[PDB]
């Protein structure tokens, strides 16, 4: 437990990367979090929005 | 009569496979240390789910009955084991108050603990553990059947040892998948400060 | 390199220019062995109408 400083740098960067990745599964107010899914389901004009 | 649902009532909520990771999922689970209604006959409600269990010896418990009006007016599912096979039907029967039409569906194929979970279309989970008064401890439930019958249910009953009736609630848990993908332990994420 | 630097001369070094990316050669589709067929043989090849 003396090496907390280095452990802290490693842990902080790991958590940043994991949050960045898990942002992929959010809708932000759109229909579906998958791109091809909206391209197939919704018409191009709606898919644009 | 009542008893205390210590730790039981956990079922693999989906089909994915995870190894040695602590997953955190929100769904309808049976709250830990809850109140189970000790029985040894009548109808019961179907609020949002059931934790039907049993500590049987000579298969006194045979089957279930579901449905809204519980007789001829709507359809009413019926699972039965008549010592041959589990003859499932969905025929809108005219029922008898002491047992022991269009059919949109059919099918024909103390030391026993047959834990079961039912919910809505219709899903079932089960687990058949040897036992020897509800034993503490932990055991997950594998999903053995799904039925796309679209029936509307609000009540149920039992055909004809003792059984118990939980009631699921929408509570977040914390599951411990082991390395084989087997749930080995869970933590009710709202039970008490330590658990939060 | 000359184009990304906006220059006609580049001093010695190592610059990053583009993004190597393999392309998906062919699509594939998989579904369980189709069985449990409908009994149309009983509707059309029935003895008596």
């Amino acid at each position: 437990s003396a090496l907390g400083k280095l452990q802290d740098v490693v842990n902080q960067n790991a958590q940043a990367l994991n949050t960045l990745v898990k942002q992929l599964s959010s809708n932000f107010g759109a229909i579906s979090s998958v791109l091809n899914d909206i391209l197939s389901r919704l018409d191009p004009p709606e898919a644009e929005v | 009569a009542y008893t205390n649902s210590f730790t039981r009532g956990v079922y693999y909520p989906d089909k994915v496979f995870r190894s040695s990771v602590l997953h955190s999922t929100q769904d309808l689970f049976l709250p830990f240390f809850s109140n189970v209604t000790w029985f040894h006959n009548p109808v019961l409600p179907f609020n949002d789910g059931v934790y039907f269990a049993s500590t049987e010896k000579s298969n006194i418990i045979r089957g279930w009955i579901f449905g809204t009006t519980l007789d001829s007016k709507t359809q009413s599912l019926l699972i039965v084991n008549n010592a041959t096979n589990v003859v499932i039907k969905v025929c809108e029967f005219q029922f008898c108050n002491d047992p022991f039409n269009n059919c949109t569906f059919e099918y024909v194929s103390f030391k026993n603990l047959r834990e079961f979970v039912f919910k809505n279309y219709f899903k079932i989970y089960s687990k058949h553990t040897p036992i020897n008064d509800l034993p503490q401890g932990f055991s997950a439930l594998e999903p053995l059947v799904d039925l796309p019958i679209g029936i509307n249910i609000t009540r149920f009953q039992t055909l004809l040892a003792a059984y118990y009736v939980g009631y699921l609630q929408p509570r977040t848990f914390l599951l411990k998948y082991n390395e084989n993908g087997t749930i080995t332990d869970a933590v009710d994420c709202a039970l008490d400060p330590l658990s939060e | 390199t000359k184009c990304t630097l906006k220059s006609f001369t580049v001093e010695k070094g190592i610059y990053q220019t583009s993004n190597f990316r393999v392309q998906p050669t062919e699509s594939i589709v998989r579904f369980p062995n189709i069985t449990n067929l409908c009994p149309f043989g009983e509707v059309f090849n029935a003895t008596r109408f």
Binding site: - | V16 | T1, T17, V22, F31
Partner: protein, 166 residues
């Protein structure tokens, strides 16, 4: 119904199909084509439910009898059970990565050497380093001061008719 009539009075058998759709999950669905299985190529798979692009390879993971997918610590698809023959395949996204252009100054020579980052250097005189796939530079056994840094301890330089050494 007499057999010597014309086709006008001749009997006809009629079957009428009524496709009813109520708000139910549509149990009566048709067949689904299932192409052959190809491995070890960046392909665009669509298994029974899920889609995506990858490189399918025979794995050794042991699912449970009813499980279908596998996921990573970051909630990403990693293994799929072949719904026809129950063999569990992995999923490795086919390689991408940056492209760097090692060069002495244009004031010296027009020769360069490319470095594809993080590839097995068989997916594109051709050196394979711990950094990537170096293309266009001789591999010396010597060791001099680092002129152009690359990574993992490799350094390249323009030396003796001359060329680029790493």
């Amino acid at each position: 119904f007499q057999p010597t009539n014309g086709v006008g009075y001749q009997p006809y058998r009629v079957v009428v199909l009524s496709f009813e759709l109520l708000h139910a999950p549509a149990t009566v669905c048709g067949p689904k084509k299932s192409t052959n299985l190809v491995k070890n190529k960046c392909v665009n798979f669509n298994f029974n439910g899920l889609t995506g692009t990858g490189v399918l390879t025979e794995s050794n993971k042991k699912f449970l009898p009813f499980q279908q997918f596998g996921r990573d610590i970051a909630d990403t698809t990693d293994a799929v059970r072949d719904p026809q023959t129950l063999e569990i395949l992995d999923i490795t996204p086919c390689s991408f990565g940056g492209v760097s252009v090692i060069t002495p100054g244009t004031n010296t020579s027009n020769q360069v050497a490319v470095l594809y980052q993080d590839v097995n250097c068989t997916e594109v005189n051709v050196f394979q380093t711990r950094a990537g796939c170096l293309i266009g530079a001789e591999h010396v056994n010597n060791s001099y001061e680092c002129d152009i840094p690359i990574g993992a301890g490799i350094c390249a330089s323009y030396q003796t008719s001359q060329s680029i050494i790493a």
